[PDB]
Amino acid sequence: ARVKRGVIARRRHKKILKLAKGYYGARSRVFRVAKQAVIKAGQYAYRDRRQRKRQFRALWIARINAGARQNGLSYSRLIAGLKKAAIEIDRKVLADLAVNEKAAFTAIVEKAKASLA
Amino acid sequence: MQLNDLRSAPGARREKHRPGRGIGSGLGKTGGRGHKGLTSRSGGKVAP
Amino acid sequence: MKTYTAKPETVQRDWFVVDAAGQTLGRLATEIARRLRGKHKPEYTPHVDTGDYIVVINAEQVRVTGAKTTDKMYYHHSGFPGGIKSINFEKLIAKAPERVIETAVKGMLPKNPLGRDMYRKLKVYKGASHPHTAQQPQELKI
RNA sequence: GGGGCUCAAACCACACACCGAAGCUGCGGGUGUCACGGUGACGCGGUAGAGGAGCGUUCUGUAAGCCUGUGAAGGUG
RNA sequence: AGGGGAGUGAAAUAGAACCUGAAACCGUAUGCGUACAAGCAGUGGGAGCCUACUUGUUAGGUGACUGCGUACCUUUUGUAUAAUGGGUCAGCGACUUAUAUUCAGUGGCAAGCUUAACCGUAUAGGGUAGGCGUAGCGAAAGCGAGUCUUAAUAGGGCGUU
Ligand SMILES: [Mg+2]
Ligand SMILES: [Mg+2]
Ligand SMILES: [Mg+2]
Ligand SMILES: [Mg+2]
Ligand SMILES: [Mg+2]
Ligand SMILES: [Mg+2]
Ligand SMILES: [Mg+2]
Ligand SMILES: [Mg+2]
Ligand SMILES: [Mg+2]
Ligand SMILES: [Mg+2]
Ligand SMILES: [Mg+2]
Ligand SMILES: [Mg+2]
Ligand SMILES: [Mg+2]
Ligand SMILES: [Mg+2]
Ligand SMILES: [Mg+2]
Ligand SMILES: [Mg+2]
Ligand SMILES: [Mg+2]
Ligand SMILES: [Mg+2]
Ligand SMILES: [Mg+2]
Ligand SMILES: [Mg+2]
Ligand SMILES: [Mg+2]
Ligand SMILES: [Mg+2]
Ligand SMILES: [Mg+2]
Ligand SMILES: [Mg+2]
Ligand SMILES: [Mg+2]
Ligand SMILES: [Mg+2]
Ligand SMILES: [Mg+2]
Ligand SMILES: [Mg+2]
Ligand SMILES: [Mg+2]
Ligand SMILES: [Mg+2]
Ligand SMILES: [Mg+2]
Ligand SMILES: [Mg+2]
Ligand SMILES: [Mg+2]
Ligand SMILES: [Mg+2]
Ligand SMILES: [Mg+2]
Ligand SMILES: [Mg+2]
Ligand SMILES: [Mg+2]
Ligand SMILES: [Mg+2]
Ligand SMILES: [Mg+2]
Ligand SMILES: [Mg+2]
Ligand SMILES: [Mg+2]
Ligand SMILES: [Mg+2]
Ligand SMILES: [Mg+2]
Ligand SMILES: [Mg+2]
Ligand SMILES: [Mg+2]
Ligand SMILES: [Mg+2]
Ligand SMILES: [Mg+2]
Ligand SMILES: [Mg+2]
Ligand SMILES: [Mg+2]
Ligand SMILES: [Mg+2]
Ligand SMILES: [Mg+2]
Ligand SMILES: [Mg+2]
Ligand SMILES: [Mg+2]
Ligand SMILES: [Mg+2]
């Protein structure tokens, strides 16, 4: 029983070369270079699911700082004031109100201020 | 009771493990011999 | 419910005029770079320029503390062997007064295509007047 | 590290706040072992190496079957 | 030379270098991007433009700008290493087989189990010569649930439900 490798080997190389679509030069058309490019792309994607959550908290916090100082308060003093009174609203929701619903953000900043913080 | 319906009891037959077939098998590359030495080469046996 | 992102075609930019008439160089320059980048607006996003325009008028009357008027040096290399050249704060004010403020602000901005775009919105002059009356800049107290 | 920093953006004390990891918590999934009769509990980084369980290829039986020119294998989306 | 028609054929992109006709490699056409911008070329985010139809919480193509980010194998205490190997593609290329054994799993018989050559009505059936087990101790003669050492039914070694 002699087994020939032609059909199975070709099917396996085409799966890798389809994931390497859009890469530059030999990274999208030769198997040896495209195999390493696909592995490193998956290494980056695993790490950047952690970094996506970090990059978005930093963006919300920076926008909350800009909106609070327009009402006479810094970010660190507003967070302490919110925790003092009641509020559990996310940084994600807070950054949305700072840009879109500016009259609601002012009310929250004014209530956090009234907690003497 | 047909020829395509009868088998053996569980645990009666195994597969044998083949060294040197990829990473996922647990026996790839060196095949269970470790690194360089006498007992890592063809015919590398220590006399009784 | 995704996160808001600013669009370069729909950004609102203002004009401001800042007088350097006895301000410390580095504490004035940090306020300028903060507004060139748009960090004072809730619409700020890291990849689009949301900042304002800053005009600086009395660029030769900026000051430094300590003994920095004579002891602070500016170096640059021309690319030729031995081509290192230096000038101090006192002499640079005499020759190119505006280069003092630009050098300080430029070092506080990102070093990429976006950082060079924010720098293009800084207009530094050495008089008490600027050529940008048609834009009607509003006063900014430090 | 750079810009720049002088009743500091330095240093010595004290105080309160905040940021900050794949650590911890929340929510949704998958697995290993043990106990009970599907639940509970604590686990689940890994080289050499040991143990367990699988996918696919060719040939033989099932098969004088079943599929197929109203279109097989192969190739390409 | 080579072609464009016409004919033959079910089919000439089955036309003689003739079944199928992959990849490396080389072109033509269209869409988007690219001439102030620094590095393993990807990925997290993300505007704009083009196409299709369900006319936008949609699908496909490009990716301005921006955060992170120094290939793979081998060998090593340790490699982005300026240490080794590879120009690329396709095909091939490295734990096998025989005979003797030991352990484990799973079966057949069971104080017994099993045959080898060989006959054969030929994968049946016969063939129990032989092998292992039911008893050990001693170098042995030998004695035996005991036996060896010893002057010793003492002690001790090994063995026995
Ligand atoms: Mg072969
Ligand atoms: Mg691309
Ligand atoms: Mg972070
Ligand atoms: Mg964070
Ligand atoms: Mg291993
Ligand atoms: Mg081994
Ligand atoms: Mg080796
Ligand atoms: Mg060694
Ligand atoms: Mg060894
Ligand atoms: Mg040899
Ligand atoms: Mg830095
Ligand atoms: Mg003090
Ligand atoms: Mg804290
Ligand atoms: Mg976290
Ligand atoms: Mg954890
Ligand atoms: Mg859970
Ligand atoms: Mg763990
Ligand atoms: Mg593990
Ligand atoms: Mg068959
Ligand atoms: Mg067809
Ligand atoms: Mg076949
Ligand atoms: Mg015809
Ligand atoms: Mg054809
Ligand atoms: Mg044909
Ligand atoms: Mg034919
Ligand atoms: Mg042909
Ligand atoms: Mg081709
Ligand atoms: Mg071309
Ligand atoms: Mg350009
Ligand atoms: Mg330039
Ligand atoms: Mg370059
Ligand atoms: Mg650079
Ligand atoms: Mg995205
Ligand atoms: Mg799209
Ligand atoms: Mg990108
Ligand atoms: Mg990028
Ligand atoms: Mg890097
Ligand atoms: Mg980097
Ligand atoms: Mg090598
Ligand atoms: Mg060495
Ligand atoms: Mg060495
Ligand atoms: Mg050493
Ligand atoms: Mg390293
Ligand atoms: Mg290298
Ligand atoms: Mg090199
Ligand atoms: Mg060398
Ligand atoms: Mg090298
Ligand atoms: Mg060497
Ligand atoms: Mg070489
Ligand atoms: Mg061969
Ligand atoms: Mg056994
Ligand atoms: Mg048995
Ligand atoms: Mg005795
Ligand atoms: Mg005894």
Short mmCIF file of all heavy atoms in Angstrom, two decimals, chain E residues 59-71:
data_model
loop_
_atom_site.label_atom_id
_atom_site.label_comp_id
_atom_site.label_asym_id
_atom_site.label_seq_id
_atom_site.Cartn_x
_atom_site.Cartn_y
_atom_site.Cartn_z
P A E 59 -21.65 43.25 7.45
OP1 A E 59 -21.24 42.23 8.44
OP2 A E 59 -21.11 44.63 7.54
"O5'" A E 59 -21.31 42.69 6.00
"C5'" A E 59 -21.69 41.38 5.62
"C4'" A E 59 -21.50 41.15 4.14
"O4'" A E 59 -22.38 42.03 3.39
"C3'" A E 59 -20.13 41.46 3.58
"O3'" A E 59 -19.17 40.44 3.83
"C2'" A E 59 -20.42 41.69 2.11
"O2'" A E 59 -20.63 40.45 1.45
"C1'" A E 59 -21.75 42.42 2.19
N9 A E 59 -21.57 43.88 2.20
C8 A E 59 -21.67 44.73 3.27
N7 A E 59 -21.45 45.99 2.97
C5 A E 59 -21.20 45.96 1.61
C6 A E 59 -20.90 46.97 0.68
N6 A E 59 -20.79 48.26 0.99
N1 A E 59 -20.70 46.61 -0.60
C2 A E 59 -20.80 45.32 -0.92
N3 A E 59 -21.08 44.28 -0.14
C4 A E 59 -21.27 44.67 1.12
P G E 60 -17.64 40.83 4.10
OP1 G E 60 -16.91 39.63 4.57
OP2 G E 60 -17.63 42.06 4.92
"O5'" G E 60 -17.07 41.20 2.66
"C5'" G E 60 -17.02 40.23 1.63
"C4'" G E 60 -16.64 40.84 0.30
"O4'" G E 60 -17.65 41.78 -0.13
"C3'" G E 60 -15.36 41.65 0.28
"O3'" G E 60 -14.18 40.87 0.26
"C2'" G E 60 -15.55 42.49 -0.97
"O2'" G E 60 -15.33 41.71 -2.14
"C1'" G E 60 -17.04 42.82 -0.88
N9 G E 60 -17.26 44.11 -0.21
C8 G E 60 -17.70 44.33 1.07
N7 G E 60 -17.78 45.60 1.36
C5 G E 60 -17.35 46.25 0.21
C6 G E 60 -17.22 47.63 -0.08
O6 G E 60 -17.46 48.59 0.65
N1 G E 60 -16.75 47.84 -1.36
C2 G E 60 -16.45 46.85 -2.26
N2 G E 60 -16.01 47.23 -3.46
N3 G E 60 -16.57 45.57 -2.00
C4 G E 60 -17.03 45.34 -0.76
P G E 61 -12.86 41.41 1.00
OP1 G E 61 -11.86 40.33 1.04
OP2 G E 61 -13.28 42.07 2.25
"O5'" G E 61 -12.32 42.53 0.02
"C5'" G E 61 -12.09 42.25 -1.35
"C4'" G E 61 -11.60 43.46 -2.10
"O4'" G E 61 -12.69 44.39 -2.35
"C3'" G E 61 -10.58 44.30 -1.39
"O3'" G E 61 -9.29 43.71 -1.38
"C2'" G E 61 -10.67 45.62 -2.14
"O2'" G E 61 -10.05 45.51 -3.41
"C1'" G E 61 -12.18 45.71 -2.37
N9 G E 61 -12.86 46.50 -1.33
C8 G E 61 -13.56 46.00 -0.26
N7 G E 61 -14.07 46.92 0.50
C5 G E 61 -13.68 48.11 -0.09
C6 G E 61 -13.94 49.44 0.30
O6 G E 61 -14.58 49.85 1.27
N1 G E 61 -13.36 50.35 -0.57
C2 G E 61 -12.63 50.01 -1.67
N2 G E 61 -12.15 51.03 -2.38
N3 G E 61 -12.38 48.78 -2.04
C4 G E 61 -12.93 47.87 -1.21
P U E 62 -8.11 44.39 -0.55
OP1 U E 62 -6.98 43.45 -0.46
OP2 U E 62 -8.68 44.91 0.71
"O5'" U E 62 -7.70 45.61 -1.48
"C5'" U E 62 -6.60 46.43 -1.16
"C4'" U E 62 -6.92 47.88 -1.39
"O4'" U E 62 -8.34 48.11 -1.32
"C3'" U E 62 -6.34 48.82 -0.37
"O3'" U E 62 -4.99 49.12 -0.64
"C2'" U E 62 -7.25 50.03 -0.44
"O2'" U E 62 -6.87 50.87 -1.51
"C1'" U E 62 -8.59 49.39 -0.80
N1 U E 62 -9.54 49.28 0.34
C2 U E 62 -10.03 50.41 0.96
O2 U E 62 -9.69 51.54 0.68
N3 U E 62 -10.93 50.19 1.96
C4 U E 62 -11.40 48.98 2.39
O4 U E 62 -12.22 48.94 3.30
C5 U E 62 -10.88 47.86 1.69
C6 U E 62 -10.00 48.05 0.71
P G E 63 -3.86 48.78 0.45
OP1 G E 63 -2.54 48.93 -0.18
OP2 G E 63 -4.24 47.50 1.07
"O5'" G E 63 -4.05 49.93 1.53
"C5'" G E 63 -4.38 51.26 1.14
"C4'" G E 63 -4.83 52.08 2.31
"O4'" G E 63 -6.18 51.70 2.69
"C3'" G E 63 -3.97 51.94 3.56
"O3'" G E 63 -3.80 53.20 4.20
"C2'" G E 63 -4.80 51.02 4.45
"O2'" G E 63 -4.58 51.19 5.83
"C1'" G E 63 -6.22 51.40 4.07
N9 G E 63 -7.17 50.31 4.29
C8 G E 63 -7.02 49.02 3.87
N7 G E 63 -8.00 48.25 4.23
C5 G E 63 -8.84 49.08 4.94
C6 G E 63 -10.07 48.80 5.58
O6 G E 63 -10.67 47.73 5.64
N1 G E 63 -10.60 49.92 6.18
C2 G E 63 -10.03 51.15 6.16
N2 G E 63 -10.72 52.10 6.80
N3 G E 63 -8.89 51.44 5.58
C4 G E 63 -8.36 50.36 4.98
P A E 64 -2.35 53.62 4.73
OP1 A E 64 -1.35 53.22 3.71
OP2 A E 64 -2.22 53.11 6.10
"O5'" A E 64 -2.39 55.21 4.77
"C5'" A E 64 -2.22 55.99 3.60
"C4'" A E 64 -2.84 57.35 3.79
"O4'" A E 64 -4.28 57.21 3.79
"C3'" A E 64 -2.52 58.03 5.11
"O3'" A E 64 -1.30 58.74 5.09
"C2'" A E 64 -3.73 58.92 5.34
"O2'" A E 64 -3.62 60.12 4.58
"C1'" A E 64 -4.85 58.08 4.74
N9 A E 64 -5.57 57.27 5.74
C8 A E 64 -5.71 55.91 5.76
N7 A E 64 -6.41 55.46 6.75
C5 A E 64 -6.77 56.60 7.44
C6 A E 64 -7.53 56.79 8.61
N6 A E 64 -8.08 55.81 9.31
N1 A E 64 -7.71 58.05 9.04
C2 A E 64 -7.15 59.05 8.34
N3 A E 64 -6.42 58.99 7.23
C4 A E 64 -6.27 57.72 6.83
P C E 65 -0.13 58.38 6.13
OP1 C E 65 0.96 59.35 5.95
OP2 C E 65 0.14 56.94 6.01
"O5'" C E 65 -0.78 58.65 7.56
"C5'" C E 65 -1.09 59.96 8.00
"C4'" C E 65 -1.97 59.94 9.22
"O4'" C E 65 -3.22 59.27 8.92
"C3'" C E 65 -1.44 59.18 10.42
"O3'" C E 65 -0.49 59.92 11.17
"C2'" C E 65 -2.71 58.87 11.20
"O2'" C E 65 -3.16 60.02 11.89
"C1'" C E 65 -3.69 58.59 10.06
N1 C E 65 -3.81 57.15 9.74
C2 C E 65 -4.56 56.32 10.58
O2 C E 65 -5.10 56.80 11.57
N3 C E 65 -4.68 55.01 10.29
C4 C E 65 -4.09 54.52 9.21
N4 C E 65 -4.23 53.22 8.95
C5 C E 65 -3.33 55.34 8.34
C6 C E 65 -3.22 56.63 8.63
P U E 66 0.72 59.17 11.91
OP1 U E 66 1.58 60.21 12.49
OP2 U E 66 1.29 58.16 11.00
"O5'" U E 66 0.04 58.41 13.14
"C5'" U E 66 -0.47 59.13 14.25
"C4'" U E 66 -1.27 58.23 15.15
"O4'" U E 66 -2.33 57.59 14.40
"C3'" U E 66 -0.51 57.06 15.77
"O3'" U E 66 0.24 57.43 16.92
"C2'" U E 66 -1.62 56.07 16.07
"O2'" U E 66 -2.32 56.43 17.24
"C1'" U E 66 -2.54 56.28 14.87
N1 U E 66 -2.25 55.33 13.77
C2 U E 66 -2.75 54.06 13.89
O2 U E 66 -3.42 53.70 14.83
N3 U E 66 -2.46 53.22 12.86
C4 U E 66 -1.72 53.52 11.75
O4 U E 66 -1.53 52.65 10.90
C5 U E 66 -1.23 54.85 11.69
C6 U E 66 -1.50 55.69 12.68
P G E 67 1.55 56.61 17.34
OP1 G E 67 2.42 57.49 18.14
OP2 G E 67 2.10 55.96 16.14
"O5'" G E 67 0.99 55.49 18.33
"C5'" G E 67 0.31 55.84 19.52
"C4'" G E 67 -0.13 54.63 20.29
"O4'" G E 67 -1.21 53.97 19.59
"C3'" G E 67 0.91 53.54 20.47
"O3'" G E 67 1.80 53.82 21.53
"C2'" G E 67 0.06 52.30 20.67
"O2'" G E 67 -0.44 52.26 22.00
"C1'" G E 67 -1.10 52.57 19.73
N9 G E 67 -0.91 51.99 18.39
C8 G E 67 -0.59 52.68 17.26
N7 G E 67 -0.49 51.94 16.21
C5 G E 67 -0.78 50.67 16.67
C6 G E 67 -0.82 49.44 15.98
O6 G E 67 -0.62 49.23 14.79
N1 G E 67 -1.14 48.39 16.82
C2 G E 67 -1.39 48.51 18.16
N2 G E 67 -1.68 47.38 18.80
N3 G E 67 -1.35 49.65 18.82
C4 G E 67 -1.04 50.68 18.02
P C E 68 3.15 52.97 21.71
OP1 C E 68 3.90 53.52 22.85
OP2 C E 68 3.82 52.87 20.40
"O5'" C E 68 2.63 51.53 22.13
"C5'" C E 68 3.53 50.49 22.41
"C4'" C E 68 2.97 49.14 22.02
"O4'" C E 68 1.94 49.28 21.02
"C3'" C E 68 3.97 48.21 21.38
"O3'" C E 68 4.82 47.59 22.32
"C2'" C E 68 3.08 47.24 20.62
"O2'" C E 68 2.50 46.31 21.51
"C1'" C E 68 1.98 48.19 20.13
N1 C E 68 2.22 48.70 18.76
C2 C E 68 2.18 47.86 17.64
O2 C E 68 1.97 46.65 17.80
N3 C E 68 2.38 48.38 16.42
C4 C E 68 2.61 49.68 16.27
N4 C E 68 2.80 50.15 15.04
C5 C E 68 2.64 50.56 17.38
C6 C E 68 2.44 50.03 18.58
P G E 69 6.41 47.71 22.17
OP1 G E 69 7.02 47.23 23.43
OP2 G E 69 6.71 49.07 21.68
"O5'" G E 69 6.76 46.68 21.02
"C5'" G E 69 6.39 45.31 21.13
"C4'" G E 69 6.31 44.63 19.79
"O4'" G E 69 5.26 45.23 18.99
"C3'" G E 69 7.53 44.74 18.91
"O3'" G E 69 8.56 43.85 19.28
"C2'" G E 69 6.95 44.45 17.53
"O2'" G E 69 6.72 43.06 17.37
"C1'" G E 69 5.61 45.16 17.63
N9 G E 69 5.69 46.52 17.08
C8 G E 69 5.83 47.69 17.76
N7 G E 69 5.91 48.72 16.98
C5 G E 69 5.84 48.19 15.70
C6 G E 69 5.87 48.82 14.44
O6 G E 69 5.98 50.02 14.18
N1 G E 69 5.76 47.90 13.41
C2 G E 69 5.64 46.55 13.57
N2 G E 69 5.55 45.83 12.45
N3 G E 69 5.60 45.96 14.73
C4 G E 69 5.71 46.84 15.75
P U E 70 10.06 44.38 19.47
OP1 U E 70 10.53 43.90 20.79
OP2 U E 70 10.09 45.82 19.15
"O5'" U E 70 10.90 43.61 18.36
"C5'" U E 70 10.49 43.59 17.00
"C4'" U E 70 11.61 43.10 16.12
"O4'" U E 70 12.75 43.96 16.30
"C3'" U E 70 12.12 41.70 16.43
"O3'" U E 70 11.38 40.71 15.74
"C2'" U E 70 13.58 41.75 16.02
"O2'" U E 70 13.72 41.50 14.64
"C1'" U E 70 13.94 43.22 16.28
N1 U E 70 14.65 43.45 17.56
C2 U E 70 15.98 43.80 17.49
O2 U E 70 16.57 43.92 16.44
N3 U E 70 16.59 44.03 18.69
C4 U E 70 16.02 43.94 19.93
O4 U E 70 16.71 44.17 20.92
C5 U E 70 14.65 43.57 19.93
C6 U E 70 14.03 43.35 18.77
P A E 71 11.03 39.30 16.41
OP1 A E 71 9.77 39.45 17.16
OP2 A E 71 12.22 38.77 17.09
"O5'" A E 71 10.73 38.35 15.17
"C5'" A E 71 11.62 38.27 14.08
"C4'" A E 71 11.08 37.38 13.00
"O4'" A E 71 11.81 37.59 11.77
"C3'" A E 71 11.20 35.88 13.23
"O3'" A E 71 10.19 35.37 14.08
"C2'" A E 71 11.14 35.32 11.82
"O2'" A E 71 9.80 35.27 11.36
"C1'" A E 71 11.87 36.40 11.03
N9 A E 71 13.28 36.06 10.76
C8 A E 71 14.39 36.71 11.19
N7 A E 71 15.51 36.19 10.77
C5 A E 71 15.10 35.13 9.99
C6 A E 71 15.80 34.17 9.25
N6 A E 71 17.12 34.12 9.17
N1 A E 71 15.09 33.25 8.59
C2 A E 71 13.76 33.29 8.66
N3 A E 71 12.99 34.14 9.32
C4 A E 71 13.73 35.04 9.97
#
